[PDB]
Structures are given as structure tokens and as C-alpha cells.
């Protein structure tokens, strides 16, 4: 269950495809 890179991210439980979670989105 990945995250779309660009979607509702967190900045310490983020769960991004590939990328990282900045301010409010992963990418």
C-alpha cells in the first residue's frame, strides 16, 4: 500500500512509493 508520490504524506510516519514526505505531500 504505497502512496502516490504527491498525495497526503506525513513528516515522521510518511509511506511514500519511492520518494519522502515534504510538508504535507509525498514525493
Not at 515534504?22 to 514525493?27: A, F, H, W, Y
Given at each position: 500500500?504505497?502512496?502516490?508520490?504527491?498525495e497526503?504524506?506525513?513528516?515522521?510516519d510518511?509511506?511514500?512509493?519511492?520518494?519522502?514526505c515534504?510538508?504535507?505531500?509525498?514525493?
Open positions: 500500500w504505497c502512496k502516490q508520490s504527491g497526503m504524506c506525513n513528516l515522521l510518511q509511506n511514500c512509493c519511492d520518494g519522502y515534504i510538508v504535507l505531500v509525498c514525493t
